[PDB]
Amino acid sequence: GKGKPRGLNSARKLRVHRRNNRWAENNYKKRLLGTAFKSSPFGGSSHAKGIVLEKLGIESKQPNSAIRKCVRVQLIKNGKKVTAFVPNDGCLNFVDENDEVLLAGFGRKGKAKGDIPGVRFKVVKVSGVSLLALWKEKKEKPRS
Amino acid sequence: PRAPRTYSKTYSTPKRPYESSRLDAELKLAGEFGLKNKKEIYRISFQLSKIRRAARDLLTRDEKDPKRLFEGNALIRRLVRVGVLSEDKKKLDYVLALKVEDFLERRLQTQVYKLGLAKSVHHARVLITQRHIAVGKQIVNIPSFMVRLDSEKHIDFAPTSPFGGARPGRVARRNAARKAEASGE
Amino acid sequence: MAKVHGSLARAEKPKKPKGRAYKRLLYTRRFVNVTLVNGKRRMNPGPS
Amino acid sequence: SKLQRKNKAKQLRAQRILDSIENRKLFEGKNGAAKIITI
Amino acid sequence: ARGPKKHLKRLAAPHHWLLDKLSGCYAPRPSAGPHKLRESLPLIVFLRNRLKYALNGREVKAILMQRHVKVDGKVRTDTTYPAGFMDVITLDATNENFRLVYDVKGRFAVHRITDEEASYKLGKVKKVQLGKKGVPYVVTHDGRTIRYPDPNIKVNDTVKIDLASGKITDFIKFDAGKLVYVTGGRNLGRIGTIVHKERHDGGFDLVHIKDSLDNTFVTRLNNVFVIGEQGKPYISLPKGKGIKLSIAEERDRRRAQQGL
RNA sequence: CGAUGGUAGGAUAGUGGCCUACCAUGGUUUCAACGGGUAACGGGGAAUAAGGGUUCGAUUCCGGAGAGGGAGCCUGAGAAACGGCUACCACAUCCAAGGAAGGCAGCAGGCGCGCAAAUUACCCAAUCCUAAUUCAGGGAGGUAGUGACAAUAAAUAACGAUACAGGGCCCAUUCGGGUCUUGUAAUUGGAAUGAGUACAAUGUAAAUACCUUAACGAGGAACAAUUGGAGGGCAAGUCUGGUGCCAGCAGCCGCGGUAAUUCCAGCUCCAAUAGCGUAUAUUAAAGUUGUUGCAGUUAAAAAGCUCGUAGUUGAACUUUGGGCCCGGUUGG
């Protein structure tokens, strides 16, 4: 008999069980409780600006092994701090500090059995100039 | 404030991007007819796939049902008036097997090459763009005119173009101003 | 590095043709001629 | 409640918005100003 | 708000005036007068959107200030005076006389009449009461009060009014088998005759009306305007004469008439 | 300290616990009252869509509320009004120190914040409203500047000659006798044209621009298309160069330990052509929310056991058949 009621005047059990155990869909519970403000470092935004504390070097332990270059930062609207990532100056020659930077996220989920370890962010521009415009060398960093 | 101005989008891309048996039949239409990109071929499949949907449900409701008779005999009447349905195929089931080049063979780029004015299908789209061809009295310059049926027979050159009319362009005038005055010196 | 500001227009390889003419070129190079490697098919190949 | 803005706002900027006052407003216009203009 | 409103926005204007939805931002708002707001038509929608005489608002005021346009034998200069049903609009420097009456698809029609039909006006009967110092009066649908009527007049009847002195010539009762115009709703503008009228106590009463081609319909009591006895109206009807034509019937009747 | 009702007054434009007197002891609730959250103004509507549905609606129309935060009233047909007044609270401006003035969630513009949003321009010509009135007024509204927010139309090349190739149909004798198709020959020729500029005219309240048009305007090698990829998913390379210059390495399986069929570069190809390139939300894919429509033993998942609330669900039966006759549109 399927283990659910079928008769005609039964619409109240049917609609009150459905929102009862709709709380196991994993990203409907995130939306009604609203955990995007209370826990996320961004608060619900695409990008965010911070100011860089210092250069860091991080490594990936099991099967892979090389020299992943990341950066500390401190967000202006929040005060909390995160560790971003800068893409492929694999030459080890773009340290920069006490600068204004713009982060973003990865399209995130991954595999860290090679231990490409636990950061969640990246960098799209720095001090008012895009990153690729420096790597492809279309601008150079503004200063006097 | 004021009233808002309606608009609509006119094409739609397909669901699977890189699969090969699609990609070639689109290519062989773009070389056959000379079309700029594949947005021009999506433009003709959209317009078709709303015609097909419009007849797809008048077939469901009964015959001798006065919405089938008023909206049917107008949809049929408009497709013949531009010349896509054959004149013996005036029945509503026959539009459900219409194809996409039965509209592609009615553009001005295609109906001027068949009617003997340009030596190739790429001599059409450059003849039209440069204001040479004029159905009726009106210089058109759009390679997608979709000529109505009882005005296939009016296309000719323009009463302003150097081909079918008056003064030559500013090469021949410039060449005559490069040689005829230079005959003495 | 940057753009040059003086581009006023009042008063190694040869080019490719751009636009509808490029669709004409591709129609020839795979649908008016042929390329095989013994019936088996590796068109646009590596030179060997 | 959500006065925590007025905590975090009115106790982030109170001295950083104070380092740049009197250099801008020593020129109030009855006696204390002289703007020097060359042409 | 706090007081009355005084602007009418363009999309909120009544549909059967056919103002185009791009020329401006507001519409004419009709003044307070004889006929209701969404049941009338100002003198600027007549003189520049129907007869095409004037091309502006500044041209309409130049026409009205020369004291040409009358309504019901009286001069008006209010540029949004509310002319409504059965009103007579007598220009003078063309010797034309008009009468406001309904189309069939639901519109206010241009109608030219004679120089003798423009001396009178019908009007229905909205209430009949006993006034101060014991005299009775009668209230029409456009709001004229008229003291001392015949006693046999009741409500929902129809009077005939002489526009010269403002008086009554004769009247028509309200019963089965009469000629009736329909002035509001969905079957708006159709003319037919009364089959019978059932009554609901404390509710809205329904009449059943037969056409001339013998097809029937039902409306409420208050959208029903008596015109005359059968086959004989008292006014000059428009073309079509209130016959509903199906959309099938009026494509081909336009096709075969297309011989120009 | 009115909560639910009865009787009589007060007050109001007027009904009514709206308020005041005396009395009665009521009213709401598992068919979810009362309380808590809302990064909640409500609807017409919007995106996606086999069908059922999921997610949005601060925002051009209609309805409500507000004018730094609460309270109070004047004039009036109409306001508890803020481009009206008066008090306290938070602010802040000028000062001859006696005092006196103030509210941009109207329009342009500010130094603030943040990922995040235009000119202190011209006019009442149109649309409409107000006034003692055809004439005056209107940052309401119209016209331009700034605008890759979105949507429609579509330039960046088209024709010849020989030439040398092949295929090619055929004259084939075998040649070439025709028809072709390309291929290429910094091999050669002449025609077409608007991007741009600019007399006039037209537009317009005046102008600017679009439609029309004198003279000018190309071999185009320069009047020069760009973003992203080339193990797999998923269209496209067996190509040469690093001592690993300039190595984790590309959503996820993974490729590096020299020379790599992926990093870094050159060449040649592929895809879209104005890129949907990256980020964050949501919809389809999803029968992974299941009314349509899932899952019972071993894979997540049947409560220790029987009596029993509310809720849901509950056997069959009581006028069928027969006869005559008119009048519909359909196959005919």
From Swiss-Prot, chain A:
SUPFAM superfamilies: Nucleic acid-binding proteins. InterPro entries: NA-bd_OB-fold, Ribosomal_uS12, Ribosomal_uS12_euk/arc. It is found in: Cytoplasm. One of its GO terms (cellular component) is ribosome. Hydroxylation at Pro-63 affects translation termination efficiency. The stereochemistry of the 3,4-dihydroxyproline has not yet been determined. Gene3D superfamilies: Nucleic acid-binding proteins. It comes from the Eukaryota. GO terms for biological process: maintenance of translational fidelity; maturation of SSU-rRNA from tricistronic rRNA transcript (SSU-rRNA, 5.8S rRNA, LSU-rRNA); regulation of translational fidelity; translation. Keywords: Cytoplasm, Hydroxylation, Isopeptide bond, Ribonucleoprotein, Ribosomal protein, Ubl conjugation. There is a cross-link at residue 55 (Glycyl lysine isopeptide (Lys-Gly) (interchain with G-Cter in ubiquitin)). The modification 3,4-dihydroxyproline is found at residue 63. Pfam families: Ribosom_S12_S23 (PF00164). GO terms for molecular function: structural constituent of ribosome. Its main location: cytoplasm. Component of the ribosome, a large ribonucleoprotein complex responsible for the synthesis of proteins in the cell. The small ribosomal subunit (SSU) binds messenger RNAs (mRNAs) and translates the encoded message by selecting cognate aminoacyl-transfer RNA (tRNA) molecules. The large subunit (LSU) contains the ribosomal catalytic site termed the peptidyl transferase center (PTC), which catalyzes the formation of peptide bonds, thereby polymerizing the amino acids delivered by tRNAs into a polypeptide chain. Belongs to the universal ribosomal protein uS12 family. This is Small ribosomal subunit protein uS12A. The gene is RPS23A.
Curated annotation (Swiss-Prot), chain C:
The modification Phosphothreonine is found at residue 35. GO terms for molecular function: structural constituent of ribosome. Transmembrane segments: none annotated. It is found in: Cytoplasm. Keywords: Cytoplasm, Phosphoprotein, Ribonucleoprotein, Ribosomal protein. One of its GO terms (biological process) is cytoplasmic translation. Residues 1-22 are annotated as: Disordered. GO terms for cellular component: cytoplasmic stress granule; cytosol; cytosolic small ribosomal subunit. Belongs to the eukaryotic ribosomal protein eS30 family. Component of the ribosome, a large ribonucleoprotein complex responsible for the synthesis of proteins in the cell. The small ribosomal subunit (SSU) binds messenger RNAs (mRNAs) and translates the encoded message by selecting cognate aminoacyl-transfer RNA (tRNA) molecules. The large subunit (LSU) contains the ribosomal catalytic site termed the peptidyl transferase center (PTC), which catalyzes the formation of peptide bonds, thereby polymerizing the amino acids delivered by tRNAs into a polypeptide chain. Component of the small ribosomal subunit (SSU). Mature yeast ribosomes consist of a small (40S) and a large (60S) subunit. The 40S small subunit contains 1 molecule of ribosomal RNA (18S rRNA) and 33 different proteins (encoded by 57 genes). The large 60S subunit contains 3 rRNA molecules (25S, 5.8S and 5S rRNA) and 46 different proteins (encoded by 81 genes). Present with 37600 molecules/cell in log phase SD medium. This is Small ribosomal subunit protein eS30A. The gene is RPS30A.
Curated annotation (Swiss-Prot), chain D:
It is found in: Cytoplasm; Nucleus, Nucleolus. The chain holds residues 50 to 88 of 788 of the full protein. Belongs to the TRAFAC class translation factor GTPase superfamily. Bms1-like GTPase family. TSR1 subfamily. Present with 1390 molecules/cell in log phase SD medium. It comes from Saccharomyces cerevisiae (strain ATCC 204508 / S288c) (Baker's yeast). This is Ribosome biogenesis protein TSR1. It comes from the Eukaryota. Required for 40S ribosomal subunit synthesis. Required for normal export of the pre-40S particles from the nucleus to the cytoplasm. Its subcellular location and association with pre-40S subunitshifts from mixed cytoplasm/nucleus to all nuclear in RPS19 disruptions, suggesting it acts after the ribosomal protein. Interacts with RIO2.
Curated annotation (Swiss-Prot), chain E:
The gene is RPS4A. There is a cross-link at residues 61, 133, 160, 167, 173, 178, 210, 232 (Glycyl lysine isopeptide (Lys-Gly) (interchain with G-Cter in ubiquitin)). Component of the small ribosomal subunit (SSU). Mature yeast ribosomes consist of a small (40S) and a large (60S) subunit. The 40S small subunit contains 1 molecule of ribosomal RNA (18S rRNA) and 33 different proteins (encoded by 57 genes). The large 60S subunit contains 3 rRNA molecules (25S, 5.8S and 5S rRNA) and 46 different proteins (encoded by 81 genes). Belongs to the eukaryotic ribosomal protein eS4 family. It is found in: Cytoplasm. GO terms for cellular component: 90S preribosome; cytoplasm; cytosol; cytosolic small ribosomal subunit. The modification Phosphoserine is found at residues 31, 246. This is Small ribosomal subunit protein eS4A. GO terms for biological process: cytoplasmic translation; translation. Component of the ribosome, a large ribonucleoprotein complex responsible for the synthesis of proteins in the cell. The small ribosomal subunit (SSU) binds messenger RNAs (mRNAs) and translates the encoded message by selecting cognate aminoacyl-transfer RNA (tRNA) molecules. The large subunit (LSU) contains the ribosomal catalytic site termed the peptidyl transferase center (PTC), which catalyzes the formation of peptide bonds, thereby polymerizing the amino acids delivered by tRNAs into a polypeptide chain. Signal peptide: none annotated. SUPFAM superfamilies: Alpha-L RNA-binding motif (SSF55174). The keyword Lyase does not apply. The keyword Phosphoprotein applies. Present with 573 molecules/cell in log phase SD medium. Residues 41-104 form the S4 RNA-binding domain. The modification Phosphothreonine is found at residue 114.
